[PDB]
């Protein structure tokens, strides 16, 4: 991804976009009961914590575009993946406006708490004023589509979240490039059934894990992985994608029956954004921060891994590449050992910056004991080995519980963390509950005990 140009929005006929300047994150009632070192990400140029130009820092994610065309290895990767998706017999029909809006089997309804994007954000018109879940009314939306059409500017927001001290000082805040409600609706109508098909088939055929329930899915993953696992992390995945990866994606859509609307991908690839009082044009780069793009990111990941394997190991049998992606995160396997360090080298030439899995300093062998997917490890249950625990370390949960975005959601926030933490074991889970109950706020929460969560887990299979 690369920024073509940037300049005053008024110069191209756009209004200034008002974005919040103060974090909604604040110390929670557990701030001093649990250890933590993360703070709210910088949201404005004038943050006292900054030690470098803010604007420069947030846009530095666009490292440029290392490739132009789709080479021979990418074409091969496209044929193999597309061929693989074909076995799913995906409904290529466009989805009706209603379902695209309020959901159907395999597709959750539009999120009402997220931005409606341009131009609604400049007219102070919310999503709650356009659709109601009770009526499933399409009249208002239909009128808005007819009025403002599609291919509208994406509105940029700095993501309000916890970041390390280093990332705060270096102004490295992540960004959300929210597309207009019109485009999200149009895209869900164009690809609605593809999305549903993926959500209902998380695994190694779709090569995707979006829509999955870790508590249940973790027990299925091992039986899908090959003998030798391999993995690595990306640095700025979305922003690094060159236009070629988007073309590769369109070829896949074409071969599986969606050639009808591959134009929507151009909208993601070559897109223009609004940020404050500035407007800019980006070539390449997948718009970040929205869930409407995690499937295409996942699809592209499948194309990337396949490409690097073909380029690095001619003769590789892609039919024995078993991988599952979730955006840039991935867990993969092959009957034979592979060199992630070598693959990372091939990656550079394709505009991808790959590093050791889970921030190691060197590329080590990935095993079932050290592998993580969505920050979670894999641990067989002591009593029923065939049941696999998705284990997220307590460090993450501790960091998160030390802050709040709304006292009214304290119960849900803490309950959410409990669903993640009990997997660390009864002894650890109880220490967690005891500390929570060491302060008034915690003692007033309704939280599940360990045996209750274990029982519920067994009853969910
Ligand atoms: Na883009």
Alpha-helical runs (H) found in 201-293: 214-217, 237-240, 243-253, 263-269
Tell me the C-alpha distance between 344 and 338, whole Å. Answer: 11
Q: Is beta strand 388-391 parallel, antiparallel or unpaired with respect to 377-380?
A: antiparallel
**Residues contacting 442, CB < 8 A, separation 6+:** 29, 30, 414, 435, 436
Tell me how far the alpha carbon of residue 243 lies from the centroid of ligand 1, in angstroms: 8
Say yes or no: 132 and 272 in one domain: yes
DSSP H or E stretch at residue 420: helix 410-421
Give resolution, Å, one decimal: 2.3
**Residues contacting 48, CB < 8 A, separation 6+:** none
Tell me how far the alpha carbon of residue 3 lies from the centroid of ligand 1, in angstroms: 9
The tokens for 128 are: 């709650």
Which letter does DSSP use for residue 407 in this model? G
Domain end marker among 310, 334, 367: 367
Tell me how far the alpha carbon of residue 363 lies from the centroid of ligand 1, in angstroms: 31
Tell me how far the alpha carbon of residue 323 lies from the centroid of ligand 1, in angstroms: 26
In a domain, 28, yes or no: no
Q: Is beta strand 154-158 parallel, antiparallel or unpaired with respect to 270-275?
A: parallel
Tell me the C-alpha distance between 120 and 291, whole Å. Answer: 20
Tell me the C-alpha distance between 288 and 129, whole Å. Answer: 25
337: CATH: 3.30.70.270
φ, ψ dihedrals at 336, nearest 5°: -115, 155
The answer to whether 3 touches 280, Cβ cutoff 8 Å, is: yes
Say yes or no: 351 and 443 in one domain: no
Which letter does DSSP use for residue 281 in this model? E
Burial of 78 (0-12, 13-18, 19+ CB in 10 A): buried
Long-range contacts of 217-220 (CB under 8 A, 24+ apart): 217/390, 218/376, 218/378, 218/388, 218/389, 218/390, 219/386, 219/387, 219/388, 219/461
Say yes or no: 425 and 362 in one domain: no
Tell me the C-alpha distance between 428 and 345, whole Å. Answer: 40
Among candidate residues 354, 77, 390, the one with its CA nearest the CA of residue 231: 354
Tell me how far the alpha carbon of residue 411 lies from the centroid of ligand 1, in angstroms: 38
In a domain, 31, yes or no: no
Say yes or no: 124 and 176 in one domain: yes
Tell me the C-alpha distance between 218 and 423, whole Å. Answer: 12
In a domain, 65, yes or no: no
Say yes or no: 265 and 304 in one domain: no
Tell me the C-alpha distance between 156 and 121, whole Å. Answer: 11
Tell me the C-alpha distance between 104 and 100, whole Å. Answer: 8
Domain end marker among 344, 367, 390: 367
Quote the domain boundaries for residue 103.
1-13+70-202+243-284
Report helix, strand or coil for 3.
Answer: strand
Give me the torsion for CA of 405, 410, 416, 421, rounded to 10°.
100
Residues tagged in the binding site annotation for Mg(2+): 233, 328
Tell me how far the alpha carbon of residue 241 lies from the centroid of ligand 1, in angstroms: 9
Tell me how far the alpha carbon of residue 62 lies from the centroid of ligand 1, in angstroms: 10
Q: Which residues of 345-370 are buried (b: 16+ CB within 10 A; e: fewer)?
A: ebbeebbbebbbbeeeeebeebeeee
In a domain, 158, yes or no: yes
In a domain, 37, yes or no: no
Tell me how far the alpha carbon of residue 158 lies from the centroid of ligand 1, in angstroms: 17
Among candidate residues 94, 357, 318, the one with its CA nearest the CA of residue 207: 318
Tell me the C-alpha distance between 18 and 432, whole Å. Answer: 40
Tell me how far the alpha carbon of residue 271 lies from the centroid of ligand 1, in angstroms: 5
Tell me how far the alpha carbon of residue 183 lies from the centroid of ligand 1, in angstroms: 14
In a domain, 33, yes or no: no
Task: Tally the C-alpha atoms within 13 A of residue 267's C-alpha that lie toward its C-beta.
Answer: 20
Domain end marker among 367, 392, 419: 367
Into how many domains does the chain fold?
Answer: 3
The answer to whether 303 touches 197, Cβ cutoff 8 Å, is: no
Tell me how far the alpha carbon of residue 156 lies from the centroid of ligand 1, in angstroms: 12
Tell me how far the alpha carbon of residue 95 lies from the centroid of ligand 1, in angstroms: 25
In a domain, 207, yes or no: no
Report helix, strand or coil for 11.
Answer: helix
DSSP H or E stretch at residue 271: strand 270-275
DSSP H or E stretch at residue 40: strand 39-40
Using CA of residue 183, residue 188, residue 189, residue 195, what is the dihedral sign? positive
Tell me the C-alpha distance between 75 and 303, whole Å. Answer: 9
Tell me how far the alpha carbon of residue 164 lies from the centroid of ligand 1, in angstroms: 27
Tell me the C-alpha distance between 459 and 166, whole Å. Answer: 43
Tell me the C-alpha distance between 67 and 262, whole Å. Answer: 20
Give me the torsion for CA of 96, 102, 105, 107, rounded to 10°.
90
| DSSP-assigned beta bridge partners for residue 377 | 391
Tell me the C-alpha distance between 128 and 120, whole Å. Answer: 12
Among candidate residues 313, 315, 334, the one with its CA nearest the CA of residue 323: 334
Say yes or no: 123 and 219 in one domain: no
Among candidate residues 444, 445, 181, 204, the one with its CA nearest the CA of residue 306: 204
The answer to whether 370 touches 444, Cβ cutoff 8 Å, is: no
Tell me the C-alpha distance between 292 and 262, whole Å. Answer: 16
Tell me the C-alpha distance between 287 and 271, whole Å. Answer: 8
Tell me the C-alpha distance between 18 and 157, whole Å. Answer: 10
The answer to whether 117 touches 290, Cβ cutoff 8 Å, is: no
Tell me the C-alpha distance between 367 and 384, whole Å. Answer: 21
**Residues contacting 282, CB < 8 A, separation 6+:** 1, 2, 3, 4, 62, 270, 271, 272, 273
Say yes or no: 127 and 170 in one domain: yes
Say yes or no: 229 and 300 in one domain: yes
Say yes or no: 6 and 91 in one domain: yes
The answer to whether 369 touches 384, Cβ cutoff 8 Å, is: no
Task: Tally the C-alpha atoms within 13 A of residue 218's C-alpha that lie toward its C-beta.
Answer: 25
| DSSP-assigned beta bridge partners for residue 259 | none
The answer to whether 334 touches 321, Cβ cutoff 8 Å, is: yes
Burial of 114 (0-12, 13-18, 19+ CB in 10 A): middle
Say yes or no: 89 and 128 in one domain: yes
Tell me how far the alpha carbon of residue 286 lies from the centroid of ligand 1, in angstroms: 5
Tell me how far the alpha carbon of residue 207 lies from the centroid of ligand 1, in angstroms: 23
Tell me how far the alpha carbon of residue 387 lies from the centroid of ligand 1, in angstroms: 41
Say yes or no: 118 and 266 in one domain: yes
The answer to whether 171 touches 54, Cβ cutoff 8 Å, is: yes
In a domain, 129, yes or no: yes
**Residues contacting 315, CB < 8 A, separation 6+:** none
Tell me how far the alpha carbon of residue 108 lies from the centroid of ligand 1, in angstroms: 25
Residues tagged in the binding site annotation: 233, 328
Say yes or no: 259 and 232 in one domain: no
Determined by X-ray
Strands of the sheet containing 228-230, edge to edge, are 228-230, 329-334, 322-326
DSSP secondary structure string for all residues of 55-117: HHHHHTT----S--S--HHHHHHHHHHHHHHHTT----SPPPHHHHHH-BTTBPPPPTTS---
């Amino acid at each position: 991804g690369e920024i073509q140009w940037m300049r005053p929005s008024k110069e191209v006929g756009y209004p200034i976009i008002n974005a919040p300047s103060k974090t909604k994150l604040e110390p929670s009632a557990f701030h001093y009961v649990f250890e933590g070192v993360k703070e709210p990400a910088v949201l404005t140029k004038n943050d006292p914590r900054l030690k470098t130009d803010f604007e420069e820092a947030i846009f530095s994610k666009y490292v440029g575009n290392k490739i132009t065309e789709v080479d021979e290895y990418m074409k091969e990767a496209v044929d193999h993946y597309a061929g693989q998706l074909m076995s799913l017999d995906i409904n290529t029909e466009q989805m009706c406006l209603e379902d695209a809006m309020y959901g159907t089997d395999g597709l959750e309804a539009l999120d009402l708490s997220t931005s409606a994007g341009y131009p609604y954000v400049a007219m102070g018109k919310k999503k709650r004023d356009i659709l109601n879940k009770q009526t499933r009314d399409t009249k208002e939306m239909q009128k808005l589509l007819d009025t403002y059409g599609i291919n509208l500017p994406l509105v940029t927001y700095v993501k309000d979240e916890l970041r390390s001290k280093t990332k705060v000082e270096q102004g490295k805040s992540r960004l959300i490039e929210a597309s207009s409600l019109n485009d999200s609706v149009a895209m869900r109508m164009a690809f609605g059934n593809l999305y549903a098909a993926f959500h209902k088939n998380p695994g190694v055929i779709t090569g995707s894990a979006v829509g999955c329930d870790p508590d249940l899915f973790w027990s299925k993953i091992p039986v899908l992985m090959e003998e030798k696992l391999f993995a690595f992390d990306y640095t700025g995945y979305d922003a690094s994608l060159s236009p070629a990866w988007f073309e590769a994606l369109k070829m896949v859509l074409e071969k599986i029956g969606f050639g009808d609307r591959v134009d929507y991908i151009d909208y993601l690839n070559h897109s223009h954004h609004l940020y404050k009082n500035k407007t800019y044009c980006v070539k390449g780069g997948m718009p970040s921060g929205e869930s409407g793009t995690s499937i295409f990111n996942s699809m592209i990941n499948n194309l990337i891994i396949r490409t690097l394997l073909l380029k690095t190991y001619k003769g590789i049998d892609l039919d024995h590449l078993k991988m599952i992606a979730y955006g840039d995160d991935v867990i993969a396997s092959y009957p034979h050992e592979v060199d992630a360090s070598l693959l990372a080298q091939s990656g550079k030439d394709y505009g991808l910056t790959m590093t050791p899995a889970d921030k190691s300093a060197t590329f080590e062998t990935v095993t079932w004991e050290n592998v993580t997917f969505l920050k979670r490890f894999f641990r067989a249950d002591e009593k029923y080995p065939f049941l696999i625990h998705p284990v997220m370390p307590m460090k993450e949960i501790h960091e998160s519980i030390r802050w709040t975005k709304d006292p009214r959601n304290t119960q849900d926030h803490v309950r959410s963390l409990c669903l993640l933490a009990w997997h660390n074991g009864e002894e650890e889970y109880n220490k967690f509950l005891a500390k929570i109950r060491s302060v008034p706020i915690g003692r007033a929460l309704d939280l599940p005990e360990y045996s209750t969560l274990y029982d519920r887990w067994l009853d969910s299979f």
